[PDB]
Ligand binder design. Sequence first.
Ligand SMILES: O=P(O)(O)OC[C@@H](O)[C@@H](O)[C@H](O)[C@@H](O)CO
Ligand SMILES: O=P(O)(O)OC[C@@H](O)[C@@H](O)[C@H](O)[C@@H](O)CO
Lengths: 557, 557
Amino acid sequence: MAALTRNPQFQKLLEWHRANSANLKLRELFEADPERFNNFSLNLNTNHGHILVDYSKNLVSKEVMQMLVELAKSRGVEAARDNMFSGSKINYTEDRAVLHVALRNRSNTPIKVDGKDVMPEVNRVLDKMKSFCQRVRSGDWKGYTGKSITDIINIGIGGSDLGPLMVTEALKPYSKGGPRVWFVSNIDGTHIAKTLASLSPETSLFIIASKTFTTQETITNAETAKEWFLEAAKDPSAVAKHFVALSTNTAKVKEFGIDPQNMFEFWDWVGGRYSLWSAIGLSIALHVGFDHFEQLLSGAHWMDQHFLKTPLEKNAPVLLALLGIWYINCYGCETHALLPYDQYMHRFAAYFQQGDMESNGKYITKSGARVDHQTGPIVWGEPGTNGQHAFYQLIHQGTKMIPCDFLIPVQTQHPIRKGLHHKILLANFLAQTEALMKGKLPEEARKELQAAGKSPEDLEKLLPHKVFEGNRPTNSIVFTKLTPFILGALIAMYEHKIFVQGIMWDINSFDQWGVELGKQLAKKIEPELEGSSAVTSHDSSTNGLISFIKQQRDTKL
Amino acid sequence: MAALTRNPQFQKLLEWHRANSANLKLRELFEADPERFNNFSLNLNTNHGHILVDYSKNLVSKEVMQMLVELAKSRGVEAARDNMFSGSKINYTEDRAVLHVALRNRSNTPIKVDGKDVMPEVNRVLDKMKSFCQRVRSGDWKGYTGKSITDIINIGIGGSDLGPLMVTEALKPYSKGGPRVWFVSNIDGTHIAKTLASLSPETSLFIIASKTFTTQETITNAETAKEWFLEAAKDPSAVAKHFVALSTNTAKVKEFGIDPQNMFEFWDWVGGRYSLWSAIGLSIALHVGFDHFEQLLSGAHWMDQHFLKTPLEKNAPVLLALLGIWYINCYGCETHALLPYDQYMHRFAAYFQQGDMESNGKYITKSGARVDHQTGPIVWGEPGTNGQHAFYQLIHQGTKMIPCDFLIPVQTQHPIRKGLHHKILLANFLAQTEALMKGKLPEEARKELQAAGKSPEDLEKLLPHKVFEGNRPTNSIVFTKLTPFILGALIAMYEHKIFVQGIMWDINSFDQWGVELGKQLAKKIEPELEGSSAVTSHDSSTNGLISFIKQQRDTKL
Ligand SMILES: O=P(O)(O)OC[C@@H](O)[C@@H](O)[C@H](O)[C@@H](O)CO
Ligand SMILES: O=P(O)(O)OC[C@@H](O)[C@@H](O)[C@H](O)[C@@H](O)CO
């Protein structure tokens, strides 16, 4: 088998689930114990706001949580965590350290890789970012015609795109005095074309974000941007005023033709999907200011320390991870929904789609043996309250069990109409998890149908449609306000949740070998699309699709 | 038990799956039969472009498809379809017709509800929309200070938001000469506040989109917009130049203060999640022009006729539905991914997340029986190529089976760099489904590692991580260009897929009693948030979360 399934604490948990999980009813759990909320929630005081992690509306008892914590211990979570933090090469397939925690290590306590403290270099790049932010935001950095920069365009994909995008969206209220920020990522020419259409070459600065500086989408987009720029500037030396690079590849940055002083470095132990805390966050710092960027780092650092110092039984990312294991490996739930009741957080779910799914969508363990159990879930979601009108129908009355995290700030960035909108938002946030837990009983629905003037025949037929089984588990994560600090803490919390799950599954959360095949096959097809010749080199579907492309591309509509 | 599980053709299908499905291997299926693509694809000529539905990379044989079509016939799909199209009240829990097909019935063949043809009123409202669009887009319609309208703002949620949003995004290239369009939907005050911050009351036209005209988010947002407007205009008569309504509720529209001449009517047989074809599409028509809106309707009409007149074995929405049943009810796949390789289509997946999940996230059948089988899947996705860098790791190398629909236009709206970007986009579109199908055997990966110069130790360590199991099924849907017509056909195709699945499961695809419950929920909690006193009226979690809100809302950060 695999490490997890051979573990006796896991076997005990699974056997308990088989024998007892039918006895678990949320309504009954709360009725039996008025201390349930108190015993199944964590109220974290960060000194810069509180984060309440309420996991009480979950299908767990004291005994279940105990079994889960014991499993985390016997799967080596505590030791694995310490190994990450100390710079051990825990990304074992690539023989790399995993040190996004170093990027936000505000204490500056030494963290060594290959015997060398990484903190001086982390801080050197941060200082460079701060200086660049001053130059650009002040208007001192001039474009090729001597004008101040008004627009910043990040060009990158995946880990070099989603973090900065999600964070600048979430922290929009903190962007006064900052340039407008744009994100180009898709190779689809629509993306760069529609972006450039709204910009002036005189006042636009491009940030080319790429760990490797070889990613086809990013370099192609970058070259398109440069061509557009040079059409107006007509001077190759002006490129240095309008293009900067975030990379680990000094040589490839030079080949593109960017000034070496224009390069903001990061390191191989910064995974792309854990990179917003590094030089990759330059567009964040430019947009909201370096002070706010430091606050974002500080929030993450707080959560890192919480994760490092806290006994597992009251350790927020550990508990979230354990609940996920319970639902994935015992209940067999394929998915996990992230439902922020916050428009600014509209890209939060998409961010953790990558963070979670690219990390833990794995099937080979440390020993090289194939898993014989589920690993990472499919992560999805949209902001509330919109979901209530759109897919919550299925959450309430479908045939799937879907663990949901509901998230909301207590304080809104826009307290319009004396707080009326936020009052309603909060009320919906609370009511939805309550409804998911409680459902609606036949006796309740029957009285409603009776009062609505339904005939005995109509009542009889309608009744089962109006009944809600409930017993649908949720987490509620509530925080004082969505400030840069609190957002940093929240992102770090989910990073560590993902880490804990990966350790428990015995997989590598930090590689991504699954990207290779698609890239190889795309390289083969690209040159085949050019010209009129029939393509026969693939399976009949691929060939047939190419034939359709060649036949349809000249047709005038 | 339920209709589907009691059905002998379904039990035959399921038994066949049990005995034979493990022997279905895509790589080998294609090798054995050069005609596979030809036998498992539909090349539809609409006379306004082609739509190729290539379903050959699915885990199916001729026999499987035969059994599925037989099941569809046994479940009375054709009769149910005819009943929808004829105006029968197939929404049985609400006693309503289901007539989104009437909205786009370009043929004008009578469709009767309660003995009366609905087409005259459909066309009267369309004519009203056409006239209004001409007046606004020409600049003739003037605001309260005598200026032309520059911005239109749709206020609505769910079915009154997502359709027009997705379509205006998808058809952005067709919006030259139209006013800017904004969508406000969330009750979260951020949504309206940030929208209004960018607008002038003098040049903004608000569209209040609401079937009932009682939805809390929409009416609150509308009242907020009206207050903001009147703060500037200071004249109630000015509202008639700046507010229109899309509704079925004349009385409530009047009560809000909107002119009856400013009301664009629709009907109870237009489900919200099927409503973009109605008056609800006014923001589409304003943005891209009425002619393009008519083309959108015409494309849907083409697909309606395809669905109505085509034998099941060659009927695109039917085949898509049947493949879904195969994966849902035989393989047990919880989810369905929609992956359009088109930035303009960035909200397409979200739209059908609503359309599918709200329709078929049900568990009571027409007979009143609780289903003892799965119904609607969780629908999710993001546009390619970004997904390849976000979550495709899990699709390729996770532990979940995930049916994916890959979609792309042959012709791009922006053929920049002499088509270079689109060439790369197409190459990735093709490569990804090829990769998911083919995988990479241990021996193939071994040879690659050997060629790369890996030592026996390093090779053995890396090998299992480099293996792709493949056999991951996809649909490829390729179309000449994403024009208004073709988009209309594509949306209608998925509408009918959803319909067919609903009939086969014996559920009502057209009610939403879970969504209806949601609108009953927050009212109780609302007044409890006011004041400093503790709330004890709920379960301890709801109580505890309310306590946290009250304790945290005054803290300065
Ligand atoms: O930053 P690069 O080298 O251009 O790579 C861009 C993306 O492919 C990359 O971020 C990818 O999402 C993952 O490896 C992140 O963990
Ligand atoms: O359009 P209304 O009445 O304001 O309702 C707004 C939404 O609740 C409504 O569209 C909901 O998404 C579903 O019923 C659509 O099928």
